[PDB]
Amino acid sequence: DSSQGNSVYQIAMVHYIKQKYPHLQVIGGNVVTAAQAKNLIDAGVDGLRVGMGCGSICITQEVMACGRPQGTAVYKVAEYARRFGVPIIADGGIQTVGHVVKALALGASTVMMGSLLAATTEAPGEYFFSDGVRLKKYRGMGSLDAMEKVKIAQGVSGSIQDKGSIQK
Amino acid sequence: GYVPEDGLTAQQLFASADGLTYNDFLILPGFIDFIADEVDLTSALTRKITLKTPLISSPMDTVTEADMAIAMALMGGIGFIHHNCTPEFQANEVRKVKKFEQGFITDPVVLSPSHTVGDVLEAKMRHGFSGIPITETGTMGSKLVGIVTSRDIDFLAEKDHTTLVMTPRIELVVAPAGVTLKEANEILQRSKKGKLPIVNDCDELVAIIARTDLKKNRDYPLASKDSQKQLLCGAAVGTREDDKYRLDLLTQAGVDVIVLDSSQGNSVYQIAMVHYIKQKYPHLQVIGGNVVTAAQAKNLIDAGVDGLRVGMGCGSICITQEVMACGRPQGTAVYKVAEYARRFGVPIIADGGIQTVGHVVKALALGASTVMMGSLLAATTEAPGEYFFSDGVRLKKYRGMGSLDAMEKVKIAQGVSGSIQDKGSIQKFVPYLIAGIQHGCQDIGARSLSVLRSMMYSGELKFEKRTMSAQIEGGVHGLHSYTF
Amino acid sequence: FVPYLIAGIQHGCQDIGARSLSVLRSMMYSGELKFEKRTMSAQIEGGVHGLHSYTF
Amino acid sequence: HHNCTPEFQANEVRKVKKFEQGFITDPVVLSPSHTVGDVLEAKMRHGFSGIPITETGTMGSKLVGIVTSRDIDFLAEKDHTTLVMTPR
Ligand SMILES: NC(=O)c1ccc[n+]([C@@H]2O[C@H](COP(=O)([O-])OP(=O)(O)OC[C@H]3O[C@@H](n4cnc5c(N)ncnc54)[C@H](O)[C@@H]3O)[C@@H](O)[C@H]2O)c1
Ligand SMILES: NC(=O)c1ccc[n+]([C@@H]2O[C@H](COP(=O)([O-])OP(=O)(O)OC[C@H]3O[C@@H](n4cnc5c(N)ncnc54)[C@H](O)[C@@H]3O)[C@@H](O)[C@H]2O)c1
Ligand SMILES: Nc1ncnc2c1ncn2[C@@H]1O[C@H](COP(=O)(O)OP(=O)(O)OP(=O)(O)O)[C@@H](O)[C@H]1O
C-alpha cells in the first residue's frame, strides 16, 4: 500500500515476500505508467493497483503535481500488464455504474471502490445525523485525521450519506 | 536500459500551441531511490547569486519590506524590497536587512542622562519595551554610562519626572567587542540580567542582546548570506531618470541585486537602465523583466541582465490581459523563456499565478530556477501593514502595484486591491512549502532541482495533459461535505 | 468614458509595439504580430483569482 | 455557596478569612529534593515561576532559597537536576 509503488522500498518488500512466503499472492502499486508497471512486474508481483490522485478524497495532484487521469492510466497500465498475463485493479474515481463498465472495458480485470462502498452497514465506525440526514465518516489514509495515529496532507476527511447494506 | 515510453516530453507537451497553464498538465511519477529529506533545493537567482531554496517574496508594498526580506533570507530564499516608497525609505529598509544579526538588537533605542523618566515611559508606550541603555551623547557611538528599565521606573508615581534611576556603568555586565552567541548565553545564564550591552575597546556602546531575543535563538542553516556573513537583500527599481538616484542610495545601503520592475520589460527605457547599471555599478546583479516571450528575453539578455522575471497577467490581482489583451499563459511562458535563457546560462524567475505546492513543483520542472510569490507569502506576520477583522476572520490588505489604490501616492487601472486570510509566520509556513517541494521531487524521482530540470530537458521527465474532467477528478469530488 | 477607452487602446498598442492602428494591422498581416490561444484554465488565471474578497 | 462538599466550602471561607492585600495567599513552595521539572509543572498548571524553597517543602521551615524563571530559562530539556537555587 503506497501512493507511488515504484520505489526501492516496495521492490525490496516484494522480493522479501516472494522469497519467505512463496504461496502468497502480492499486488503492488499504486502505479499510473507502464515504466512503474515494468519495475513491479520484474519484481514479480501477481497484480497491479492502478491510480494516483483520482480518489474522491485525494489531493495528491494539487500538492505534488503528480498523477494521471484515470481512464488513460487504466488503459496504458493494463495494456502493458497484459503482455505478461498480470491483471490490474482500476482503483479510484468510481462514482457510477458507467464508471465501472468503462474501467472494465479499458482493460481493468477488477475495480476497487472506497467511497461507493462507504456509509454502508458493513463499513467501520458509526453513523451520525446532520441537517436531518444520516451520514458516516469517510477519510483518506494520508489525511491529517488518519495519519495522526512537518507532515503534508495527501488526502481529505469528510462525510458520505447512508447507503444501506452491501448485500442489497 | 529499456524504459517503456509513456507520456509526453516537455517539448511535445508544448508543441500543440495551446495556452497551457499549471492546471492543464501533470507530471508523471518516476522511480524512487532516496528519501524526501535528501532532495537538494539549491537554486541560481542570477549568473552569480545562489540561494539554498527557490522561494522569493515579490517586490510589492503589501509583501516585502525588511522583516519579510529577513525572514525570507533566514529561511533559505531572498526578498526584494518594494519601491512604492521614498528613495531614502527603501534604502533604510535595505540597511535594516544588511545590518541584521540573530539575537542582537537592530536599531536600539538609547537615551542621554538629560532625558526625563517621562521619555522612558513614552518609549515604552510607542515601542512596547522599557530596557533602554544610557550614553554620554545620545545614541550608538559614545560611552555607555548606565541602563534604565521598567524595574528602575515601577514605584515612581507620575508626580516624579526626574532626569536619568540609572544603574551606572560600574554596576553593568557587558560583552567586550564582538561575541559568538555562546559567550552571550554563558553571560546571560550566569548574570540573570535582561540585557547584555556590547561595547568597544574604547567603551562606545556598539550593540545590545535582549534575554528575550537570546532565549528565542535557533539554527538557521540555509541562512542565505553574503561573503561578509550578512543576509542577502534585493530591491526593486523603475526605469525613469528618478531611479538613478534610488540606485545610488540602494548601492550605499549595500543591496546585492536589483530587479527592474515593469509589466513589459522589453523597452528602450529598460535597456538604457540596464546599460547604465552595468556601466556604473559593475559589481551589481540585475534581473530584468517582466518578459513572456523569447524575443523580449533576447533583447534583455543582450542588454546584459543576470536573470529574467517571467510573467504577464497571471498574477492573482492582475487584470492586464483584460484591459490590454496582452500576456501569455504562465506554464507556456515559463517553458519558452526558460528554454531560451538556458542557452546563455541565465536563470529565470517564474513570477505569478502560484497558489499551491504543485504549482511550485510544476514551475520548477518547466525550467524556472526560482519562484516569486506575492499572494502566498502575503497576510503573514512579516508582511507589511496590519490586520483587520471582517465577519470574524483576520484579513490583511494585498494590493497589486498597478491598482488605483497603489498609484494614488487619466490613468488606466491594471491591478486590483484585495485581502487575504491570515496565514501565520514565514518561519512556520516556508517549511511547509519546502517539505511539499521535496516530497513532489521525490515522487517525480529527482534528487535535486538541477536534476529535475536536466531530466525535463532530455525527455526523461514525462508529462500529461488534462481535460476539464481530469482537473475535476483531480480535485475533491463525490463527498457530501468535507473539511481541510 | 471615451477618453478612458482611447487611453486603454493606446496603452494596449504600446505594449504590443504598434505606434498606430495601421502599423498594428500591417504587423498582423505580415506575421510579426504573434498570438497565443488560451485554454479554459488560462482564461481563469488571466482573471482575478485566489483572493478572499477583491474590489474594482 | 453550598452546592459543594463541606470541606470545599470551609476552604473557600478560609481563603477569604486569611486573605491580605498585596501578600500572596496559599503560596506554591518546593523542597530541595524536587527537580527543576517540578517548577515547570507548577508553571503550566498555575502560570507563575517564582517559587521559594524550604526544608519541608511548604510554609513551615527555614527559607533555604528561591527558584524562578531566570534560574530555569537557559536549561535544555537534557537537564532535570534537583534544585539552580538563589540561596538564603
Ligand atoms: N491515490 C493514491 O494512490 C494515494 C495517494 C496518496 C496516499 N495514498 C495512501 O496513503 C497511505 C500512505 O501511503 P503513502 O502514500 O504515504 O506512501 P508510503 O507510506 O508507502 O510512503 C511514504 C513515504 O515514506 C517513504 N518510505 C516507505 N517505505 C520506506 C522505507 N522502507 N524506508 C524509507 N522510506 C520509506 C516513501 O518513500 C515516502 O516518502 C496508503 O494507504 C496509500 O495508499 C494513496
Ligand atoms: N508583470 C505584470 O503582469 C504586471 C502587469 C501590470 C503591472 N505590473 C506592475 O505594476 C508596477 C508599475 O509598472 P508598469 O507595469 O506600469 O510599467 P512601468 O511603470 O515601467 O511603465 C509605465 C509606463 O511608463 C512608460 N515608461 C517607463 N519608463 C519610462 C521612461 N524612462 N520614459 C518614458 N516612459 C517610460 C512605460 O513604457 C509605460 O507606458 C510594477 O510593479 C509592475 O511590475 C506588473
Ligand atoms: N532598547 C531597546 N531597543 C530596541 N529594541 C529593544 C530594546 N529593548 C528591548 N527591545 C526589544 O523588545 C522586545 C522585548 O524585549 P524585552 O523582553 O527585553 O522587553 P523590555 O526591554 O524588558 O521591556 P519591558 O520592561 O516592557 O518588558 C525584544 O524583541 C527586544 O529585542
Ligand SMILES: Nc1ncnc2c1ncn2[C@@H]1O[C@H](COP(=O)(O)OP(=O)(O)OP(=O)(O)O)[C@@H](O)[C@H]1O
Ligand atoms: N546588563 C545589566 N547589568 C547590570 N544590571 C542590569 C543589566 N541589565 C539590566 N540591569 C538592571 O537590573 C534590574 C532589572 O532589569 P532587567 O532587564 O534585568 O529586568 P526587567 O526587564 O526590568 O524586569 P521585568 O521583566 O520584571 O520587568 C534594573 O535595575 C536594571 O537597570
Ligand SMILES: Nc1ncnc2c1ncn2[C@@H]1O[C@H](COP(=O)(O)OP(=O)(O)OP(=O)(O)O)[C@@H](O)[C@H]1O
Ligand atoms: N509562589 C507563588 N505562589 C503563588 N502565587 C504566586 C507565586 N509566585 C507568583 N504568584 C502570583 O502569580 C501572579 C504573577 O506573579 P509574578 O509576576 O511574580 O509571576 P512570576 O512568579 O515571576 O512568574 P513568571 O516567571 O511566569 O512571570 C501574581 O498574582 C502573583 O501573586
Ligand SMILES: Nc1ncnc2c1ncn2[C@@H]1O[C@H](COP(=O)(O)OP(=O)(O)OP(=O)(O)O)[C@@H](O)[C@H]1O
Ligand atoms: N527576594 C529575592 N532575593 C534575592 N534574589 C531574588 C529574590 N527574588 C528573586 N531573586 C532572584 O533574582 C533573579 C530574578 O528573579 P525575578 O523574580 O526578579 O525575575 P524572574 O521572574 O526570574 O524573571 P522575569 O521577571 O524577567 O520574568 C533570579 O535569579 C531569582 O532567583
Ligand SMILES: O=c1[nH]cnc2c1ncn2[C@@H]1O[C@H](COP(=O)(O)O)[C@@H](O)[C@H]1O
Ligand atoms: O488519504 C489518502 N490520500 C490519497 N489517496 C487515498 C487516501 N486514502 C485512500 N486513497 C486512495 O483512494 C482510493 C479510493 O478512491 P475512492 O473510492 O474514489 O474514494 C483508495 O483505494 C486509495 O488508492
Ligand SMILES: O=c1[nH]cnc2c1ncn2[C@@H]1O[C@H](COP(=O)(O)O)[C@@H](O)[C@H]1O
Ligand atoms: O497591480 C498589479 N498589477 C499587475 N501585476 C502586478 C500587480 N502587482 C504585482 N503584480 C505582479 O504579480 C506578481 C505576484 O503574483 P501573485 O503572487 O499571483 O499575486 C508580482 O511579482 C508582479 O509581477
